[PDB]
Amino acid sequence: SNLIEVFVDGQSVMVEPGTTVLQACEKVGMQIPRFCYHERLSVAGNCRMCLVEIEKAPKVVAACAMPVMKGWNILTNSEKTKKAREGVMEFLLANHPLDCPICDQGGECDLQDQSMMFGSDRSRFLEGKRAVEDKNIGPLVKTIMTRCIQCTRCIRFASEIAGVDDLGTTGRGNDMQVGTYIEKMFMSELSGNIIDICPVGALTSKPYAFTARPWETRKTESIDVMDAVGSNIVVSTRTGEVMRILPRMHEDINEEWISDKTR
Amino acid sequence: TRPTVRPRNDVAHKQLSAFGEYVAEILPKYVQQVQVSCFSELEICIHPDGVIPVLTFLRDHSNAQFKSLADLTAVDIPTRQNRFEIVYNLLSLRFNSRIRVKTYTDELTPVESSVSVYKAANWYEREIWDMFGVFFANHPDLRRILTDYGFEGHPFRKDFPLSGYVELRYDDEVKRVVAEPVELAQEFRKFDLNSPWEAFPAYRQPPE
Amino acid sequence: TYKYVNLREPSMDMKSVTDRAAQTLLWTELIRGLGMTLSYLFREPATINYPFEKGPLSPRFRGEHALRRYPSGEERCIACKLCEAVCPAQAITIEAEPRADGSRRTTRYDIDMTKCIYCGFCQEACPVDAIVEGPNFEFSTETHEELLYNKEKLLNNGDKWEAEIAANIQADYLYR
Amino acid sequence: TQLITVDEKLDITTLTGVPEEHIKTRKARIFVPARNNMQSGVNNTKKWKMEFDTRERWENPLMGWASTADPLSNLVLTFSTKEDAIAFAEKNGWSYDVEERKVPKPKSKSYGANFSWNKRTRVSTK
Amino acid sequence: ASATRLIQGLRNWASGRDLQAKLQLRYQEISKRTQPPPKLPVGPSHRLSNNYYCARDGRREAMPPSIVMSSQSEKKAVSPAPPIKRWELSQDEPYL
Amino acid sequence: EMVRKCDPHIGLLHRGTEKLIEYKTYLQALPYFDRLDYVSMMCNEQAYSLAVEKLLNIQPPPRAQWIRVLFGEITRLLNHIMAVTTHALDIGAMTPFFWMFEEREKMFEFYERVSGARMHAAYVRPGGVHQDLPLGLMDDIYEFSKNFSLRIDELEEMLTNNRIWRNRTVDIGVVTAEDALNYGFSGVMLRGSGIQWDLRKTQPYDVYDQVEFDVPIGSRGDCYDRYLCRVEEMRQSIRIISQCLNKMPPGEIKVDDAKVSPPKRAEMKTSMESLIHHFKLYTEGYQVPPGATYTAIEAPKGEFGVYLVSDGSSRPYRCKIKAPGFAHLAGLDKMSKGHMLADVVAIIGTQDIVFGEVDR
Amino acid sequence: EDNKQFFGRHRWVIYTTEMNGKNTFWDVDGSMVPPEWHRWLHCMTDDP
Amino acid sequence: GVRTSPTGEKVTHTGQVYDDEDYRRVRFVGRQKEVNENFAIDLIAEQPVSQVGSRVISCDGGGGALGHPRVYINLDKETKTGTCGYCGLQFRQQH
Amino acid sequence: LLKKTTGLVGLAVCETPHERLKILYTKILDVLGHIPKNAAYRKYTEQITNEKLSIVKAEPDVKKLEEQLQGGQIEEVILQAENELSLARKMIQWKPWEPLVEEPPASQWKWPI
Amino acid sequence: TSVKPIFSRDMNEAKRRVRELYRAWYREVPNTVHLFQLDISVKQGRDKVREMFKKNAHVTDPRVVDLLVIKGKMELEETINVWKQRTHVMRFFHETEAPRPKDFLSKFYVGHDP
Ligand code: SF4
Ligand code: SF4
Ligand code: SF4
Ligand code: SF4
Ligand code: FES
Ligand SMILES: [K+]
């Protein structure tokens, strides 16, 4: 075997050549924080949350995109790795709106969770925030684009998995707006999985909008019957009433997606 | 790390590591692990056959003199094949120190009663019998202490539900408080509160 | 750093022995106790005239619950369910949906006041000052289900006690 | 000798005080819980679980609350391995099914594949 | 406070103490029920620089318990700590 | 007349507190501790707070620690008033009960001014206290403590030199020192028998090494010396309250780790990190690192210990509550032998037994 | 008001004989105080 | 803005009213159904639309710390006003 | 000087503390001589017992003996000598210098699970 | 497979203890009907004791039946002493509970429980 030897916090691990730093850390049971990375999309490399330290190297590397080299010690819990995470979380929460109570992603938000786990605990931002114009891309996906962190999981999903090529970023700089640029209605058969792979509340389920909250739901693991694919789903119930339907990750059927009828 | 972080007590940590080596080499027949936590609390992990020798040693040795039983506790951990974790919290008034003696049993192996060492345990391990089902052999008066008199099942076991299996109401037919199966007017809402992101890297368990 | 309570040796001269025997035969400490009880007989009692006089309370006081509103008539609760997530009694039951103008508002906001432990975690977890635990404590009922408040009872408590709850929050919010 | 040889099956169901209705008619489910696809974290998918079949939840006539008659409805047990959960289910007379751990297969990620020369994996945007 | 001097004198005599100096009924010497608004100070972490959370992360410095001995000379017999210093009798009021 | 065997049947107020703690977070399980020893509320709050702050590897600010010691000694005054006055009311002296519950009413007004509830404050929290002192409170604490010595003086006038009180207490309930250690006694049950041990001196917590007080040591182990120990502990608690009012520092009242203690509502409504941290602390709560601890404080009844176990999550895996009244009521069987049925109620009075902490 | 009384007696209310229709000549009630006077009477403020 | 069903029962602001064939109207027999007659959905439609001269306006519900968390509202749509997600006050750019 | 009381209830004043401590320390050494020499309990207990017996023989005073034995009153030093004697008699019967009776299960003391 | 016994080395000593516990309950039931002044007969109480002993008649583990004998002796000491009230004795007789549906068809009629 052509496995090369890399080190994750001093611990040796044998990886295939071409393996990213994030997967080399995943093999030892360590999950690097990420926002744009998603293992079924392509690698964007732009949320800059996976900035990990390789020792004897005076620059942090993007772990979702950087391939490993033989002999690297990937310092996942080092000081400048943690400073990189706190700084990038600070810039992510600079213009992010104070919507956590009125947001359907609260309690199931990656931005909240790894701001608690990897970010700082207070704000140095003493300025005005941006307010991004909302869009209408269908009766299924509620669009609140002030909450967007421009991670382009939308665009990679609609480009690669749904195969639509109609979502995209318009603008340049802090005025860059993910959308369709026109009053276009993103109706695929897979148009609801962008609610799954939005890490923030910028794309939320419009039938599930405002109705429940993820800590009080009971996750029941069931099967789809809308089609003969047999999509593994989660039925989440609150007080004996069906609240939504989430996918289950099953590699051999529906990798982590479901259709809009199922959802 | 000055104002908002707890100050670390390295002196008591080194003293308890030395005394843990002391206990581990005086009594190697029973001591399995010795560990000192980062907030400097010594733990002696023993075999369940060494309840009386370890506690008598700590009560009577001149370098221990743990004359006071503070607390005695079981902990149900169902993923272990010896699911109960009987925990002895001792107090030395001479050396101004505390030690934690920990052992184990399952549902069917009895722990030897420590009332011949500490008479404080006469209600504590009685409570452990009442709450967990751990039988204590050679106990003076072992019976229930907290539950209702006809109460079946051991409540602090983790396979026991929060509300029980029966509830009480007064029944005017039989003119008597009766026991009928529990039916809540509002079910206890279970909250899945655990974050999916890892909180502490120092406690990361190695994968398979 | 310690003191000995009750470690006095009594004197055995005839003066102190006769003092103790006069205390024994003439009941001197019993007359001292009668004198102290007689001294409280001639004091003004601490008794307030309830219901016409009331016990002194602070603006932090935690009594009857109330759902509040903004200064526009719009109710403050935006259905975020922090108060039933933090409620240590699970007294609060919340259901929600978008109403006719699409706003995130509750349809159910119940509080079982017979579960409630009156600890005020809901008013301190509420990000919009919607649920408050107001100053009313004289709300004793004659039926058990009268203490099972729905959203309408709590909105009427808010509309009833807003003129007092607003001033208590005005007096207290700089400590929060 | 002070040790005895017992070759029988470990069964403590006469000692747990659970009634027969909640022993022989309940179905335990031994499973690693699926990842919340709302999130990317995998810390909740580490340990095995044991929950039971969901029995009836009905409406309270007074308040509309979720009434139940099921004591095991909120009971979720956390196990380190699959076999510990199977041993705990067999010890307590609970009928069980086992869903295996569904680990995601390793992906061949290439950032340079997004800008290929002749392959269909070119991104049209970034 | 409203008591006449005869009742006040009888009361002080019967208790053996002066009771108007220490009244258990409160009067206008207590604080005002309406108070000026506070300006509460902030903590030490309210800083705009040299305030990285990783250098003051309290929860993340707790390590697992250091295993002293496990089953996987003429060295000194030790105690868990130095023996306790004997308490000194109070110089304030020992009742001695 | 004599008592041969005394069998206290308990569990009549068993609520299953420390199983309900397992299904609630640390902030939600804090108000369970107000109701264990329900005359020593903020002391049990302080013990659970110190357990969670030991596991979280954080510390309260100085002003929060001084407020904790101030209200802990107010709490000690409350509990010893309850102890002495009901121990006198059960024997028959009903009058100093009414005399001291007005002072106790004023201290419940202190609790209501600082927290909003008169008894169960949920105020002393992991990280510090919930909220700062309102303006004008310490002046009223001064005006209380300046007069409370005369109240202890007239209580001690009614009971201490009284021959009927000494007949019901002097030859009653005598415990040797080795039996008090062996029965796991704590606090006044140790110190009446002469054992020089007090957890505020030997193993001190928040700022008790910076306050100066004396520890009343009994001589005969009987009911009467433990009565005098509680009276002198009220004297010394007035002493500590004077030192705490004089040495109060300024500053914050929570830990400024906003991942543990929640941010202020002024900055919760302005900042983004502060809103995320408010949200996640009041729904999920803070995570505690894995570990078991035994934190024990000097409760006004004795040693109130908590064996708290964390699995790494935001809820306690196991939380054992060691209470003094459990071991004291276990020792009732030896203390009542050789005495009469009238002496048993005196022994249950001098063992300050609240059955909420006995039964949990 | 009577600020020479001790703290607890110094403020009181003489209830009306008719509130919301009910004869309250003998049936006085603690919850007859409106919320604007309930701060003053319960000493939550010094200002009526 | 409370209406009334044909059964004589007042309809809440949610829309809840018991049916005619529903036995649960017996709990109001001899007693009253306590509803709040100040519907917030009517009382926010009575508010005037704030004509601000900015492209992005902030709202905290008034009072500062006594309101809700401060949000920033975009006003680039001329078809629609900009409604605050918490307090429901709606804004319009005055050009 | 004949100390009037110890202060501890039930712990009576010993009239001859030095001779009593000599008897108890030599009786601890006599009992402890039956334990094998490779046991750490015997080495450590002979060490602390020889130190205590040397301090007792090297001090005619009672107060100074209390301040340098560093175990409180002299009567509870006597009581701890009695406890050590009874303990050593029990350690002969238990024989805990032997190896471990049973290894724990493989994930027994693993926390968290 | 080598475990520590509780009281019984094998099943025969365990059956001896089960038999003596049954003897003690059979002797105790008339006094229980008398001093609790239960409204049932002595034959009904003894048949309930027989029902409770035959509820556990399927156990072949000596430690489990040792703990069953220990718990039965505890209930017997709570009954000999007047520690139970009439309610704790009559909880063995589920009188106020309606009879549960036994067959498939009536359980199908009344609910969802198998
Ligand atoms: S997306 Fe996340 S961080 Fe943003 S408002 Fe919603 S819950 Fe808060
Ligand atoms: S809307 Fe969501 S998924 Fe799409 S780019 Fe923005 S943050 Fe990413
Ligand atoms: S005061 Fe406490 S118990 Fe009551 S509703 Fe609020 S959070 Fe729940
Ligand atoms: S915390 Fe406040 S806004 Fe949120 S659901 Fe409760 S009352 Fe409503
Ligand atoms: S995860 Fe690598 S940069 Fe977004
Ligand atoms: K989303």
Ligand SMILES: [Zn+2]
């Ligand atoms: Zn607003």
